[PDB]
């Protein structure tokens, strides 16, 4: 909703949301968010913005490995739903990251 | 010594320069191989022994017209480093040729001018050929002339510019490109000779009797106009004129530096044998409105100053008889504050005849370059065109996204509007 849209605008990402479910599927936007919240840990150089299934799995695997190392938890079922493009998984992952990074509430 | 550096910008620049340098190598007898089998020092710098190179640069952003010089019949004439070509053209965009794609090629252009300027001892001026209706000619010609003023101060600049025609033109965004280029040449060019392709089209149709004239036909008799302007520097004559002599007898105010052009004897050989070309008969054909090289009516305006460039077997007596009979004619009209408005220049060489041109072999010729208030008609016609297109922002995103800001359109519109106001009030009684 409005809080997570304000939060994703405030990071000033290169990728524009529009259809957010299709936009965040490749993992480039969540990689950008994670890189903004951890500049030293995650860089945009190690991620390829492509619609390929293998490259998508590579980006999400790096993201999963680094967030598992750093303690931040996102659901693997939500990751599978994001890479399969089911409706609402991208939304739920966005609010989960919104609560995880800088903790607020969801209405 | 006396030397002029000719700078040709854009597609119109290269092809006019191809016809111009064809004529100049024929006047001095320079072969296309580059070897002559002391007058050539105005246009040719004799490099060592047995070689004469042009004092010109052929710069255009598209390579497709620079290369045809490099593989044409003039391969061995031009210096290979003076012909400058880029990757992609400005593509009819003033914003490209000025700001984005033109800045990385003007630095190599100024370096080539510096080598050409330091070689010649006494430089008379820079002759600039450009088309204000195009991308490179309006855009790169603007940025080059900005750099020529700030670096080479007080040195005269002459602009033989091709200006868009009222009736027919070859592109759509010429009213944008020509209006923006008006401010570039208003404050910088010391002499601006207006050329209109429709007028030269009508000159060819009624004089040379060519029903289908071509760009090559047009550039050949533009070259006779440029040659007769500089004919007094190269070859001796009774009434010598210089580049500095040309300005001071034509421009009475700094902001009024626009002049017309008219080459009076333009005949084929079937015209030539039945025509007794006298000085008085030719001079009456110079001031004829049909023989003007820009589509404006001198009857609508009034003459401010005029320059008469005579060549060949012209006595200094009958040139004065031609001036006296022109002054008594009521069809022309002069401003009351210029009672002696004529400049007469007589040379002792007939014009050369190119094998391949429609012009015949004539004994005497006249190039008449006059400043008048009829040039306000020329800018007023494209003032209506540019104000029509800009009113709803058509063809603007090509300019705005390419570096240029929106406010440069209205500033060039107010500058062009102020130029109209100056021409109306100066000729007013």
């Amino acid at each position: 909703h409005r809080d997570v849209l304000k939060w994703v605008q405030g990071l000033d990402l290169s990728q524009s949301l529009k259809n957010c479910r299709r936009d965040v599927a490749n993992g480039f936007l969540v990689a950008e968010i994670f890189s903004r919240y951890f500049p030293a840990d995650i860089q945009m150089h190690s991620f390829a913005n492509a619609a390929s299934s293998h490259f998508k799995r590579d980006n999400w695997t790096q993201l999963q490995a680094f967030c598992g190392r750093q303690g931040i938890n996102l659901p693997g079922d939500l990751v599978e739903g994001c890479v399969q493009g089911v409706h609402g998984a991208a939304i739920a992952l966005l609010e989960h990251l919104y609560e995880a990074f800088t903790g607020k509430k969801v209405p | 010594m006396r030397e002029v550096i000719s700078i040709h910008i854009g597609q119109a620049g290269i092809q006019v320069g191809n016809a111009c340098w064809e004529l100049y190598c024929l006047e001095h007898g320079i072969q296309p191989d580059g070897q002559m089998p002391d007058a050539f020092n105005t246009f040719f710098s004799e490099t060592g022994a047995g070689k004469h190179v042009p004092r010109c640069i052929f710069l255009d952003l598209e390579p497709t017209v620079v290369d045809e010089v490099r593989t044409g019949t003039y391969r061995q004439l031009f210096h290979p480093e003076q012909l400058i070509s880029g990757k992609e053209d400005a593509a009819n965009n003033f914003a490209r040729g000025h700001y984005t794609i033109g800045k990385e090629i003007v630095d190599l252009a100024l370096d080539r001018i510096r080598k050409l300027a330091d070689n010649c001892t006494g430089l008379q001026g820079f002759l600039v050929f450009n088309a204000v209706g195009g991308g490179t000619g309006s855009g790169l010609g603007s940025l080059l002339l900005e750099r020529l003023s700030v670096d080479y101060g007080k040195k005269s600049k002459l602009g033989f510019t091709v200006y868009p025609s009222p009736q027919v033109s070859t592109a759509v965004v010429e009213p944008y490109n020509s209006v923006l280029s008006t401010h570039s040449l208003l404050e910088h060019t010391d002499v601006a000779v207006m050329l209109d392709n429709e007028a030269i089209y009508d000159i060819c149709r009624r004089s040379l009797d060519i029903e289908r004239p071509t760009y090559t036909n047009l550039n050949r008799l533009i070259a006779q106009v440029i040659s007769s302007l500089t004919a007094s520097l190269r070859f001796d004559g009774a009434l010598n004129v210089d580049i500095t002599e040309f300005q001071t007898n034509l421009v009475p105010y700094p902001r009024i530096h626009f002049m017309l052009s008219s080459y009076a004897p333009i005949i084929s050989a079937e015209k030539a044998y039945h025509e007794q070309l006298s000085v008085a008969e030719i001079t009456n054909a110079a001031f004829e409105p049909a023989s003007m090289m820009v589509k404006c009516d001198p009857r609508h305006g009034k003459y401010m100053a005029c320059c008469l460039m005579y060549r060949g077997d012209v006595v200094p007596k009958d040139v004065n008889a031609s001036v006296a009979t022109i002054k008594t004619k009521r069809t022309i009209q002069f401003v009351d504050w210029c009672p002696t408005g004529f400049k007469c220049g007589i040379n002792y060489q007939p014009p050369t005849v190119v094998p391949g041109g429609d012009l015949a072999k004539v004994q005497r010729a006249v190039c008449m370059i006059s400043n008048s208030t009829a040039i306000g008609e020329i800018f007023s016609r494209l003032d209506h065109k540019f104000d029509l297109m800009y009113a709803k922002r058509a063809f603007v995103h090509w300019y705005v996204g390419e570096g240029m800001e929106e406010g440069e359109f209205s500033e060039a519109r107010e500058d062009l509007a102020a130029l109209e106001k100056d021409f109306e009030e100066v000729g007013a009684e």
Binding site: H1, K6, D12 | -
Partner: protein
């Protein structure tokens, strides 16, 4: 008579907010591309553009005269720009938290601004200093507005409380907790009698100034409604939704009257032109298309 007739675009990221000139047919939009663009309805082309904000411009607002336009961005910057010379007069960055909304006074001398520090500040264009700061919400103030005549300042925040205040003395007169969730936009009527509150429930509730009587309660789409406006005709209320629909509800004709589903993404700004026939809507699809 509400359909799609013209479209206005020219932004790369989502459009955050939009407004119109007080007596001219020009629409100024502030998007996430760190710029504010003014476009003309009759031609569809831009007239002016301003840039210089470091981050996404969260909202824009105009004074009653329309000479000075305020823009609050995500980098805690409030920039005041004059349209006569295209010059940014002032750039107030005293806040360290994200700014949401602005609202000029009746005379246009000072403008209130909401930030993420749970407070509403007052800034002056000539002085460039905080004149008065008020705190009556536990969350970020999402919207601020002023009555046309009196000092009735309405502040809406995410704490489900709409505060009617007297900001001249720096005090809040009262707070009403009618909203069941976070509030994003409060839109007054032509006068100051009625104020309509936006909420995450998706209801257009038009409470009174002090009585707070919900005369009409209506439902919106599944997503949370974010932007609200009232037509100058006195019978139409426009409410945007994040589900891609703009609802024009009639006051005296069956509550909900018209639905426009031309938009494809979340709409965050809605307004009506001074003529009264056309509405200007925004969205997250970077298309501030004006509905006829």
């Amino acid at each position: 008579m509400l359909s799609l007739n013209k479209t206005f675009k020219g932004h790369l990221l989502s459009v955050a907010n939009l407004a119109l000139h007080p007596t001219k047919p020009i629409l100024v939009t502030a998007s996430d591309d760190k710029t504010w663009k003014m476009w003309h309805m009759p031609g569809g082309d831009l007239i002016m553009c301003g840039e210089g904000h470091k981050d996404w411009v969260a909202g824009v607002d105009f004074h009653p005269a329309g000479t000075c336009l305020a823009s609050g961005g995500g980098d805690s910057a409030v920039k005041i720009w004059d349209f006569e010379k295209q010059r940014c007069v002032t750039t107030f960055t005293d806040h360290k938290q994200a700014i949401w909304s602005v609202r000029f006074h009746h005379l246009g001398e000072v403008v209130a601004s909401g930030s993420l520090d749970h407070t509403v500040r007052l800034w002056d264009l000539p002085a460039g200093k905080c004149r008065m700061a008020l705190r009556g919400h536990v969350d970020s103030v999402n919207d601020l507005a002023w009555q046309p005549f009196s000092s009735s300042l309405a502040t809406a925040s995410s704490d489900k409380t709409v505060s009617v205040w007297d900001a001249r003395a720096g005090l809040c007169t009262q707070t009403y907790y009618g909203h069941q969730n976070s509030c994003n936009g409060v839109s007054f009527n032509i006068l100051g009698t009625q104020l309509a509150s936006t909420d995450a429930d998706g209801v257009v509730k038009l409470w009174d100034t002090r009585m707070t009587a919900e005369v009409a309660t209506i439902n919106t789409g599944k997503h949370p409604a974010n932007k609200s406006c009232f037509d100058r005709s006195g019978q139409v209320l426009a409410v945007a939704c994040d589900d891609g629909k703009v609802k024009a509800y009639s006051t005296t004709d069956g509550v909900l009257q018209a639905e426009l589903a031309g938009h494809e993404d979340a709409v965050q700004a809605v307004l009506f032109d001074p003529a009264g026939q056309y509405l200007v809507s925004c969205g997250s699809d970077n298309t501030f298309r004006l509905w006829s």
